[PDB]
Design a protein around this ligand. Structure first.
Ligand SMILES: Nc1nc(O)c2cc(CN(C=O)c3ccc(C(=O)N[C@@H](CCC(=O)O)C(=O)O)cc3)ccc2n1
Length: 308
């Protein structure tokens, strides 16, 4: 069938590639404009195939959909919109335009974790189970009826990147492909989302990923891994804004074997720089270990080397 792909990043590219190699006509790709001279991977792949690439900076403006944008989209004649990882909220005149409407990839077990930072919050809350959902877009935020859903285990030391690469990405690509296949054969369902279990969380940017030190070690661990690597949980250390990556809960050891005292404003007590990384304390006195630190200037250094 004729598909419009509205998304970005490598996930958008992979969904694009699998759909076209299943024989669907990609009549248009609608991704983000290039910034810093870099073309989005989805735009790159599509232009090689002679598929029309669009790079709208915005779809809606002052409450309403932009007219020029909507008519450019409508011209490609999509029978279905596929939104692999669309970072932009889409006007209903676009969503409802195709024969089959629009389906959306979302990396949480809806109704839980509605919102664009669902993966982050899956970890921040320390969910034991995560996964993704392919749903039919409606006017609400991640509220549309479910087409399919897939579940995975959350590992105690999973960060965003690791659960994304192990499961959410590869199985998500196959889920998007299977969903389109169900639509084509005309047997895809519309499972209305249950009210019970529905949650919303804010979008995770750098400013609101600042660390609250006044929590148990486990909650700090979940927070840090839940923002690793983007946007990157951070805290003030000696006047500078320092980002934390690669957290693991740590019961061992005393002390663990000495190490160097590092004062952190707001921390329940002083941290310890050790040979294996930065040991941090929660308010319950328990410990976590952070492998990597990053200052505002982007260079990553091992926590063991803070003083060196
Ligand atoms: N009609 C419709 N309905 C949905 O549920 C959508 C979900 C998504 C995916 N998403 C979260 O799962 C999602 C992604 C980004 C955003 C978002 O708000 N992005 C911009 C705003 C873009 C805008 O306002 O147009 C931002 O706040 O940074 C919202 C939801 C994308 C488009 C959607 N369009």
């Amino acid at each position: 069938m004729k598909i419009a792909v509205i998304g970005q990043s490598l996930f958008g590219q992979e969904v694009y590639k699998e759909l076209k190699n299943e024989g669907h006509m990609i009549v248009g790709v609608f991704t983000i404009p290039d910034k810093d001279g870099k073309v989005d991977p989805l735009a790159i792949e599509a232009e090689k195939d002679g598929v029309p690439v669009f790079k709208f900076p915005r779809w809606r403006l002052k409450g309403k959909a932009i007219t020029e944008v909507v008519d450019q989209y409508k011209a490609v004649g999509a029978e279905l919109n596929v939104l692999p990882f669309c970072s932009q909220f889409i006007p209903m005149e676009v969503i409802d335009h195709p024969k089959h409407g629009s389906i959306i990839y979302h990396p949480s077990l809806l109704p839980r974790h509605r919102g664009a930072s669902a993966i982050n919050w899956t970890l921040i809350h320390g969910d034991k189970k995560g996964g993704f959902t392919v749903f039919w877009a409606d006017d609400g935020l991640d509220t549309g009826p479910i087409l399919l859903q897939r579940e995975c285990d959350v590992e105690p030391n999973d960060n965003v990147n690791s659960i994304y690469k192990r499961f959410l990405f590869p199985e998500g690509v196959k889920g998007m492909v299977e969903a389109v296949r169900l639509i084509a054969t005309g047997k895809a369902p519309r499972i209305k989302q249950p009210e019970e279990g529905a949650t919303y969380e804010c979008i995770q940017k750098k400013e609101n990923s600042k660390i609250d030190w006044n929590q148990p070690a486990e909650a700090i661990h979940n927070w840090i891994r839940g923002n690793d690597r983007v946007p990157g949980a951070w805290a003030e250390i000696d006047g500078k804004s320092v980002s934390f990556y690669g957290s693991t809960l740590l019961e061992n050891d005393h002390f663990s074997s000495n190490g160097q005292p590092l004062e952190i404003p707001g921390a329940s007590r002083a941290a310890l720089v050790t040979k294996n990384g930065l040991v941090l304390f929660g308010n319950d006195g328990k410990m976590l270990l952070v492998k990597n630190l990053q200052f505002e200037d982007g260079k990553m250094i091992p926590g063991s080397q803070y003083f060196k």
